[model samples]
Target: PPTLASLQRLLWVRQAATLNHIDEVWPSLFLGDAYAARDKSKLIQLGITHVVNAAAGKFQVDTGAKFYRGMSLEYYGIEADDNPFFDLSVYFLPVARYIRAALSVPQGRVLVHCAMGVSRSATLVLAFLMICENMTLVEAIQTVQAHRNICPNSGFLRQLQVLDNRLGR
Candidate 1:
């Protein structure tokens, strides 16, 4: 409970400066928005080799593997919505493993993006850090918040808390 309360205090802090369309919060791993996703040139510029579209589906950034056909980038899509009710936790482990696989490449740069890139994308990235990087949820939030702005929905926060508890954090 204290962790959840502090999580609010952390995610609640509104920082306009950190709300960029794309940010390299982790080494060779990027957290971005749909705009960044659409910018194929930007992806090339960033040397992105793998993409995880968290908001992938109709009505979202549905740019699947075909979108990056010529770019030689690996694509993984999770039709995840920004709603707290969405069961995004199921993707926590798999997505983390995907990112790990990408980064294991010699020159892998993975872009994990959603619609607005704050709520949905932030939550997944937080989960990746927690699951793969062996950080507590609070530590994951702290590490990402230090680089970029994020506000996971209340539901997403609760789900992460469950994962946090399971990890004995």
Candidate 2:
């Protein structure tokens, strides 16, 4: 598969590229360990002014003996402890609003993450696709998978169906 050096290089490149483009914000995964250790610095270097963290718990950022940096980091912790793939209700509307607001910023990229870069994040992004892109539920789900290699579990998928039916005018 992939070598460690290659993977690290890829991650570093991705981190730098992401910071450079910083286009219309969209759903993305930031696996905690690697993010805090590697990408955070790259992001700061690239002029990221704000961060909206969706993962539960405080991030392990490197503050260098200070209580905080001047960085604007807001944690809207969205947890999915119980079967992340099935827990769509815990995130749907709030996350939809979050995505809408973040994307509307007109500048900066907002990173959205769940534990494994799958499941919960996928559901939230799918909801965004439906609401913002005017995609049908099936299309939204498919889009999420295409972007992130995830599939909402049965329960969450069912809730999406209900959401779709209700959202229809």
Candidate 3:
């Protein structure tokens, strides 16, 4: 039931507007960009057990399961786009489930990432917070925005609004 403009305003009010290569938005969960996603050494340093690539395709950030060889981490890649038309909503729930399951394991650290770590990856993490963490859309924005700055596209924002209403129902 939250308006896009109102939600956009929440993102505008960014106290934690730092979009680093990788940052822990939630406990044991990292939201990062493609550059950080490919960093095997850094992932090892971060103790990541599962990685969800919101941008995953040959043309996209193509570091598939082959990238994390013998690292003992799970890899889940979603072929997504930066544009508005692509249906990113499909992965919102599934990715959240994957992330939840990953975190249930002992010492599970999940990194959800895309190209800029602003749109696709951030949106997915927002969905995770909304679905698994019992957060409203506004609450999800406020929570993640406090840790890392993120603005999903118009389409993704609208989709998140739909999700908010559904979960609200």
For model 1, residues 41-152, the per-residue Cα lDDT tens digits are 9999999998889998888887999888899888999998888799999999899999999988889999989888788888888999988899888888888887788888
Alpha-carbon RMSD of each model: 1.4, 9.7, 1.2
User: Which regions of candidate 1 are displaced past 4 Å?
Assistant: 14-18
Ranking of all predicted structures according to TM-score, beginning with the best and ending with the worst: 3, 1, 2
User: Across residues 133-160, which tens digit of lDDT does each residue of candidate 2 receive?
Assistant: 7876766645444333554445556666
Taking all chains together, each candidate's TM-score versus the true structure is 0.94, 0.61, 0.96
lDDT of 3 by residue, 1-169 (tens): 6788888878877656355898898899888998998888999999999999988999989999999987999999898898877789999989999999998988899999888888999999999999999999898888787788888888899889999999998
C-alpha lDDT of candidate 3 relative to the true structure: 0.89
TM-score-wise, the better of 2 and 3 is 3
lDDT of every model, 2 decimals? 0.87, 0.49, 0.89
Model 2 residue pairs with clashes: none
Worst 10 residues of 2 by lDDT: 16-25
Q: Rank the candidates by lDDT, best first.
A: 3, 1, 2
Model 3 worst lDDT run, 10 consecutive residues: 10-19
Better-scoring candidate (lDDT), 1 or 3: 3
